[PDB]
Amino acid sequence: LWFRTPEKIYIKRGCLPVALDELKNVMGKKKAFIVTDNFLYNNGYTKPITDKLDEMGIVHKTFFDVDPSLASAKAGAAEMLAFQPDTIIAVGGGSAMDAAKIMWVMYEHPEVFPKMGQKAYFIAIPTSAGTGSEVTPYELLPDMAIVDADMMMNAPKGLTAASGIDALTHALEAYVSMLATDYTDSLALRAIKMIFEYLPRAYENGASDPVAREKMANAATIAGMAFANAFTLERYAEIADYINNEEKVENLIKAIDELKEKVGI
Amino acid sequence: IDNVEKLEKALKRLREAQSVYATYTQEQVDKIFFEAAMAANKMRIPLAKMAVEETGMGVVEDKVIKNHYASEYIYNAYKNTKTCGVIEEDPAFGIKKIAEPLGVIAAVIPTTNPTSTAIFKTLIALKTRNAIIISPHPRAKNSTIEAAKIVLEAAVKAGAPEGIIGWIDVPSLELTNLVMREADVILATGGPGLVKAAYSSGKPAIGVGAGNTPAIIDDSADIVLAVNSIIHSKTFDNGMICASEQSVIVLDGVYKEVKKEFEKRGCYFLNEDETEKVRKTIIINGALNAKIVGQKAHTIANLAGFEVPETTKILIGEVTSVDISEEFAHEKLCPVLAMYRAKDFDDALDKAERLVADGGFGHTSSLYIDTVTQKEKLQKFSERMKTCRILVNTPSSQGGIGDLYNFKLAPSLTLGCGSWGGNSVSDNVGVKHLLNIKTVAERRENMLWFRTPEKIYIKRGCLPVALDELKNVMGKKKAFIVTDNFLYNNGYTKPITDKLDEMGIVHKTFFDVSPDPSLASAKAGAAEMLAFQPDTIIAVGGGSAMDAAKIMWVMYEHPEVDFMDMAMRFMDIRKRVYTFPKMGQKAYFIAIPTSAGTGSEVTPFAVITDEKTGIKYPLADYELLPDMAIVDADMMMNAPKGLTAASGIDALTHALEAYVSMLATDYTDSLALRAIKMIFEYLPRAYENGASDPVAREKMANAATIAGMAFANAFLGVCHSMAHKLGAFYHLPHGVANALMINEVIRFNSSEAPTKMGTFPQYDHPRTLERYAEIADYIGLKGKNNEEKVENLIKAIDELKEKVGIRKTIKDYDIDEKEFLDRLDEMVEQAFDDQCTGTNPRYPLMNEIRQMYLNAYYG
Ligand SMILES: [Fe+3]
């Protein structure tokens, strides 16, 4: 077995500026390539990142044209090759991160796993709390991950519910998986317990309950780690007890149905 | 207002008016500013005539220009500047500036600029929402008063409070002294005698200095431009304006052309007798003559006693000395000018500094030079003059008040001279000097992290695979194996050297590491590494070998590093004074544990014994994380009984203190809980059988690794701060020392009313009892009231200690009572001054640490 995670994972509210100032100017990077989508770029969710990269001396280029398509990935790779960046920042979560990873692969290896750590330094910043794509791939694994609730305060209700259910599903299959070990078991159990407590609060109040949003972000990250490191009746019984080993499955499925009802699925 | 009582009443009414005016919005202030600027601009011509008639000096046209400047440019500069409420707002942080007003201002007006300065000060006071009191010079009083009226009425026609500008009709020394002592802030002007009283009154003040300004002309200069600029600036308002050139230093190379250009355009050069006459005329009885300021060159010459053509503009007298005794080296607000002869640029710089230090210290200075190829001379000039306003190719009178010839310079009168002149501004006085910026702060939290070594391989028999990976993807060629003598003598490194000797890797081993390693062994290992120059480092020992290998790695990649500098205590890991050097260029670090409960294969700590005094110094930084962690049960199935028990209890203490620590997040919480459960579930079986229970041995190693990650990301507490010193003083094993103190630290931390807390932003209130309750619930214990659960946890820990053959107290390990008592006083101080102590939730004191030690010893 193994255990692979990104080099640095930074988690707290308001950690985006400090995670950039204290490292990016320290490493001496001079060029940045932000990759986002139309919606986030238009609403101005990339403003703090460009504002931070403006205070210190880095020139930045934004690519906001991206389910992703391979044609968009090739266009982004061509744009990267023309711009020749050094740091790649992926913002948006989900499709945006996969697209950015593919662009990174094609930009650092135009011949097309090969070793891609020479031309670019990859940073992932999620704006959704369901995918956990910043910690999952093993040569696609990002070099750094920044998790803060400020980027995820104003998510819509349907997206919030879908993201929560996706994180729950990831945690459940990470715990049940045949390759699961103690590390993934502990992470998945923690993620499930945090999901069964704060998802209704995040779906009801939304931005009015920042604690629930931050807990959902952390649970999404833990579930992503568990899924990345881990791709039966006793397992489900232990999960239910943590939250005659036959009725426990029924109670767990009833609780899952109740949670789905609470978020309007 | 010519007596005290009326002045006090005026202050009272001005304070009442300011209290109302301080709450106006942006639009009202904008309208008032616009109306006042309109009135002041429209009344530019009569004011200049009145000022010239009353003061008896100056040129009416230049005063018109000055009034028009003080209205139009002042309005244009701060036309759309925000001075009302929130200015800067950073949502990520919690900072917010409000920019409140200042209060009532006591403004002093000189006699050289009666109306323009009054207009400027009144406008900047109105824009900033402050009241103002004008104290006019006795020579120009009426004119200044009129200026204020021209604004005041306009202000109250836009919505300003009635008594928002006030003035003293008849000024006197006692009245001025009293009015300075009452206003919150003083805005002084008029040079020495008044600025000293402003700065010695008990209230904050903003004064201005004045004096000589030197103009330098060198070989590579535009002669026509320099001469004409000097003439323009000197003749502007007959030199009665401040910052006008008082002396010009011309180099030897272009003296003739400069002199010819000066005499071509209306300048009169003085011979010896006329120079002496002007000397006697200018300074009388060691003071400036009051009948010379603002007068024409012809008038000055007639006062001296000789006649000059009616078209003469400047009187120029060539002199040689720059000392105080030279009357031509002093300030003179008149068209009289002095010219110096210089040999090279350095002589010009020396004369300029000698002339600016004695006179206008901190005020303007000017240079004329070709700033295309003579870049070095410009930098030399810049890095030499104690001058707040250095001008290049610019007339000084119009350059000091800079919006005409240069931009991005604040347009204003009241030229600040900085600390050199006894002032506190060192800049052009704008609106930002009349504001009280107040900041709003919101509670944030420190950024946290999750840092682990990459490529952590977890499987029995996986060492062959992970060591074969070394050649395919990485392809290293040299290997250095750091172990201890015990495992080397018993052949515990045989598989590794067998795997390396299979293929093309040259390997060397170092086995001279004793338990509790010393720094001399670190030097020996670093020297051997330097001699061999390896590409990989492998540590195949449990507790001491990893620390030794890490310190040899540090001393090998950076031989110039110092241990005492590198082993300092800090408060924040990311704010430490000493920054660890990067370690990724020479060697590759691999850790292969053989004792379960150390966790050093995944953590940034390393403890080293000094051997000079005998103190175990722990040092921590994330640059020490190995690049490869290989854990395999095969090399851990032959541990003794006592060693296994010590390792298990040390791992349990690691997990408990990681869970309880202030730096605790969900990651370390889950890891610590899993490690805690798996240690209780499997430790006795591993201790009893050992070789016959492979499952228990694998589970113990897995739990040890989980706990290692847990406290690698969340630092430990005071239990280790005590156990380190206890095991260093009496040669006790680390696990045993941890076992004897955990059940007392648990009681120490679980207090709803602690004497002190751990001063961490996310640690809001004492919550340790609840955390211990969660631990008890997860481990499978029963209780109620959140109190019996902690007691049952303590009982379970005691039973676990009893099961693994660990005694009950310190005294059971043959520790002399007198020796213990004689060194407890010195050991407590060392226990308190430890790196881990700063992370404990309760932050123990000295007496409480001593009491814990006594309770541990006496049971
Ligand atoms: Fe320890």
- CB pair distance less than 8 Å for A12 and B447: yes
Distances (CA, A) of A112 to A95, B178, B333: 21, 85, 80
Beta-bridge mates of residue B214 = B247
Instruction: At B657, give phi and psi (nearest 5°).
Output: -70, -30
Are the C-beta atoms of B258 and B227 separated by less than 8 Å? yes
- Please tell me the total number of residues recorded for chain A in this structure: 265
CB B377 within 8 Å of CB B368 = no
d(CA B508, CA B500): 11
How far off is chain A from B832, nearest CA to CA, in Å? 30
Decide if B458 touches A, using CB distance below 8 A: yes
DSSP-assigned beta bridge partners for residue A89: A34, A123
Tell me which of B242, B334, B417, B836 is the catalytic residue: B242
Q: What is the Cα–Cα distance from B841 to B610, expressed in whole angstroms?
A: 29
Please say whether the beta carbons of B849 and B828 come within 8 A. Answer: yes
> How many whole angstroms from B724 Cα to the centroid of ligand 1?
8
Show the tokens assigned to B532.
Answer: 């061999």
- Could you give the CA distance from residue B218 to residue B345 in angstroms, rounded to a whole number? 7
Q: Is B695 on the interface with A (CB under 8 A)?
A: no
> CB of A4 within 8 Å of any CB in chain B?
yes
Q: Which of B179, B184, B177 is nearest to B168 (CA)?
A: B179
* Resolution in angstrom units: 3.3
Handedness of CA B216, B217, B218, B222 (dihedral sign): positive
At residue B815, the 3 state secondary structure works out as coil
Are residues B300 and B280 in contact, defined by beta-carbon separation less than 8 angstroms? no
Solved by what technique? Answer: cryo-EM
Determine contact, residues A48/A36, Cβ cutoff 8 Å. no
Q: Give the pairing of strands B605-609 and B616-620.
A: antiparallel
Question: What's the gap in Å between the CA of B451 and the closest CA on chain A?
Answer: 6
Asked if B574 has any chain A CB less than 8 Å from its own CB, the reply is: yes
Alpha helices in B512-592 (DSSP H): 519-532, 544-557, 563-566
Q: How many CB atoms lie within 10 A of CB B550?
A: 27
Mind giving me the DSSP string for B136-197?
Answer: --TTTHHHHHHHHHHHHHHHHTTT--TTSEEE-SS--HHHHHHHHHHSSEEE--SSTTTHHH
Q: Is B848 strand, coil or helix? A: helix
Test A13 with B444 for CB contact under 8 angstroms.
yes
Interface test with B, best of A3, A150, A190, A243 (most B CBs within 10 A): A3
CA pair distance A49, A66, nearest whole angstrom: 19
**In this structure, which amino acid lies at residue B181?**
R
CB < 8 Å to A181, chain B: 458, 702
Q: Cα dihedral angle (B789, B790, B792, B798), rounded to 10 degrees?
A: 160
Could you confirm whether B242 is annotated as catalytic? yes
Bridge partners (DSSP) of residue B30 are none
Look up residue B568 and give its two tokens. 């300092």
CA R_g for chain A = 19
Q: What distance in Å separates the CA atoms of residue B50 and residue B122, rounded to the nearest whole number?
A: 19
Q: Does A50 touch chain B (CB under 8 A)?
A: no
**Interface contact A12, partner B, CB < 8 A:** yes
Token couple for B351 = 């004369």
Q: Using CA atoms, how far apart are residues B604 and B624, in angstroms rounded to an integer? A: 5
Contact B92 A14 (CB under 8 A): yes
3-state secondary structure of B294: coil
* Residue of B448, B450, B473, B574 to mutate for A, most A C-beta atoms under 10 A: B450
Please answer whether residues B553 and B626 qualify as being in contact, where contact means their C-beta atoms are separated by less than 8 angstroms.
no
How many contacts, defined by CB atoms under 8 Å, are there between A and B?
Answer: 83
**Among candidates B399, B97, B9, which has minimal Cα distance to B242?**
B399
- Quick one: tokens of B423? 């002032």
What is the spatial distance between Cα B447 and Cα B323, in angstroms, rounded to a whole number? 62
Check if B451 contacts A (Cβ < 8 Å): yes
CA distance A68 to chain B (A): 30
To the nearest whole Å, the CA of B782 is away from the closest chain A CA by 16
Helices and strands in chain B: count of H runs, count of E runs: 31, 24
Token representation of residue B413:
């009168």
DSSP B472: I
Alpha helix locations (H) across B255-361? 255-264, 272-282, 297-304, 345-358
The set of residues, in sequence order, having a beta carbon less than 8 Å from that of B799 and lying 6+ positions away, is none
Three-class SS state of B854: helix
Closest to B402 (Cα-Cα) out of B436, B428, B374, B432: B428
If phi > 0 it is left, if psi is from -120 to 50 it is alpha, else beta; for residue A84 that is left
Buried b (16+ CB within 10 A) or exposed e, A109-123: beeeeeebeeebbbb
Please give the Cα distance from B62 to B829 (Å, whole number). 77
Q: Which residue do the tokens 């932003």 mark?
A: B761
Please tell me the distance from the alpha carbon of residue B721 to that of residue B744, in angstroms, as a whole number: 13
Q: Is B607 helix (H, G, I), strand (E, B) or coil?
A: strand
